[PDB]
Amino acid sequence: PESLLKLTRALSRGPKTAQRLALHLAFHKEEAEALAEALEG
Amino acid sequence: PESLLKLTRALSRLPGIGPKTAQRLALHLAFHKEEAEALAEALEGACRECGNLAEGELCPICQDRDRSLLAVVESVADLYALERSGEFRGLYLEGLFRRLEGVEEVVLATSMTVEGEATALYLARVTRPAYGLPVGGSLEYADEVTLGRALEGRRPV
Amino acid sequence: KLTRALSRLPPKTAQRLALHLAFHKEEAEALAEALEGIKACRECGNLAEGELCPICQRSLLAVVESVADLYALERSGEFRGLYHVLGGALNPLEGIGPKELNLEGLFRRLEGVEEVVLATSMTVEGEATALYLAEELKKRGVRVTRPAYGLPVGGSLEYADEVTLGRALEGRRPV
Amino acid sequence: PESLLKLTRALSRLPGIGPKTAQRLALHLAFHKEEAEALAEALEVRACRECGNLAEGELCPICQSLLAVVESVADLYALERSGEFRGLYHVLGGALNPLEGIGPKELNLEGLFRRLEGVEEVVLATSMTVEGEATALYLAEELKKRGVRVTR
Amino acid sequence: LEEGIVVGRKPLPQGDLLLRLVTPRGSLEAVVRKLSLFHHVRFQLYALPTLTQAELLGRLHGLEAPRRFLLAAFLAELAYRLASPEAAPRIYPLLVSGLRGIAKHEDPLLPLVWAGWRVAKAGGIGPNLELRLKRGRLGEEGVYLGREGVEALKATLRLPGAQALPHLERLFLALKAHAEEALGPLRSAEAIG
DNA sequence: ATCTGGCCTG
DNA sequence: GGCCAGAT
Ligand SMILES: [Zn+2]
Ligand SMILES: [Zn+2]
Ligand SMILES: [Zn+2]
């Protein structure tokens, strides 16, 4: 999935943790929104 | 500097990163706003009938598929892996008994973890994949229990 | 000559040990003595004092690619049959074929009623050898059995290959 | 067999080995019979005439100004892989350990005494270990009193 | 990152594996620490180059037949021996098409020879067809190809494969002789009897 | 002088 | 698998 790979790649800026976190954020919309807000913040 | 507190808490909450790792990541991202903005601009770039997560009420499995075959999956990572596999045309525990209606064979796609073992024992047509040796590699790079089970699971051909 | 011999062993530790051996003649002589002392059973193929192993001195038989595999199987403890040790596997790329294997030695030990476990490698070549031996056995009137394909113990689904999963599915068993 | 037992004993006795590793290598050599005699023939260079180091030939490459002092060949190999220094060197036959009982009389240091002639600078390439550092400092003090320049 | 096929598996005594692959950019040899045969795979090489990542793109399940496996190994070996970097962009699609044909068609020998003749033509080893072909030249010596065989060979060498198939619906012997004359003996030639 | 539990490299 | 810190 494109957004998944984009997330794993941004997190890579190991791959297994990058993947686990991308999956978690995909499965936790609220937490991912809060993280995007804090990053904008 | 009070703004960074919420960011540190947010990164701390996710599993696999400690509070000091989160603080280090926040500090590294504080003076590197170039890739912080790149990540922010790159960020943008489950149905009851299945249990699959997808945009929209109906998943792509619901949206050329049959209701005859239903497989129970432990985690959605395995669901994505089997979607990358594509060997079942069918649709994709405690609630299994009251989902038995409309199901004529039960597919068990759960992993072989001890939790899956206990769930299977508790739940005791139903089918389960076999225990055997993998493909490729070297016979000297295996484990004793797998050898024994393959010797006793030896099939006739 | 020393560096290459030390590297053949399955870098810095190899070198330190070679240096120590150079500085410890007695250990090197003892090792040469043990090597001369060390310098396959006619039927089983395992180790043996002299000609026949203590076991030799049988309805089940296990075909195996190498002696290491035989020993692994015996360590498993779930096999008390006999063995026939081939010289390898078929390989056109290495000029290995019916004129290179011990087929005729195999046929001197086989009988009509028997089961031959097909413990070949899990490759295209090992599978081709398995099918070929099975056909040769069905022609010569003997049962053919094949170990179960499936998932290994302690294996995760995410990291399993698509072929292993497909075989697991196709070979699914009732419970 | 008993030969396998003695081979495993010999392998376990030598440093830097595991008993499980020893057994697995014994079985591997039971599987490979040509590698046995190959290692046997590869098993069978002496002390340098001047320095006394192991030499591929007649002189060690050190001989073929600067003077470094070490205790093990691993230090020399780390130096050569670094490869920033070309002067003379040395290897010592021990380290002055109070609990072991090693003494300066057991050291090879009169060779260093005569070697002192025509030495612009010396480097104390001692091991980071505290006992080795103390021994190196004590030797450097014993050599400073003679009137030679000592550098770190 | 590169995409190619698996045509060589040489086990290494230290538990590693020697891999031989060909891409549309040329053949190569690679190694792996500690991907099955005849699989179209996309792989990333690091430098013999050491493979780091591999992605499976398809499996040819029907190759497990003994004769079919032998013919596929023959085709792959001939392709590799003809795998020049300049001809690689031509041979690679021909390789894939021949493998698919030998996997799917009832008789593997038909698409096998169909792909092999075109690979020989495109690899600079095109035989001179201007009834028995010897060292790639027609004459009274060599394997008796016959008028029908000569016509089918000319049609395959000139017409595209679509209408070349009906013509070919013994040339294998001539192709093997020509390849042996051009490049020397073949390791896999012992298998067929 | 002995002995348990944490650590790094693999 | 193998080496070290700290209490008895
Ligand atoms: Zn759905
Ligand atoms: Zn025996
Ligand atoms: Zn010298």
Describe the structure using short key phrases.
heteropentamer; A: 41 residues; mainly alpha; Helicase, Ruva Protein, domain 3; 3 helices; E: 193 residues; alpha+beta; OB fold (Dihydrolipoamide Acetyltransferase, E2P); 5-stranded antiparallel beta sheet; elongated; binds zinc ion; DNA-binding; dna binding protein; DNA Repair pathway
Kindly describe this structure.
The complex is a heteropentamer, with four copies of chain A and one copy of chain E (193 residues). Chain A is mostly helical. Chain A has a single domain (3-37), classed as RecR Domain 1 (Helicase, Ruva Protein, domain 3). Chain A has helices at residues 2-12, 15-27, 29-40. The longest helix of chain A is centred in the middle third of the chain and has 13 residues, at 15-27. The N and C termini of chain A lie far apart (28 Å). Chain E has a five-stranded antiparallel β-sheet. A three-stranded antiparallel β-sheet of chain E has the order 7-6-8, covered by helices on one side. In chain E, a hairpin with a 2-residue loop joins strand 2 and strand 3 (26-32). Helices cover 42% and strands 24% of the residues of chain E. Chain E has a domain at 2-56: OB fold (Dihydrolipoamide Acetyltransferase, E2P). Chain E is elongated. The chains are: A mainly alpha (41), E alpha+beta (193). At the B-C interface, helix 4, strand 4, helix 6 and strand 5 of B face helix 4, strand 3, strand 4, helix 7 and strand 5 of C. Strand 4 of chain B pairs antiparallel with strand 5 of chain C, so a sheet runs across the interface. The structure holds zinc ion (3 copies). One zinc ion is lined by residues 48, 50-51, 53, 55, 59-60, 62-63 of chain D. Chain D binds a DNA duplex (10 and 8 nucleotides) through loops.
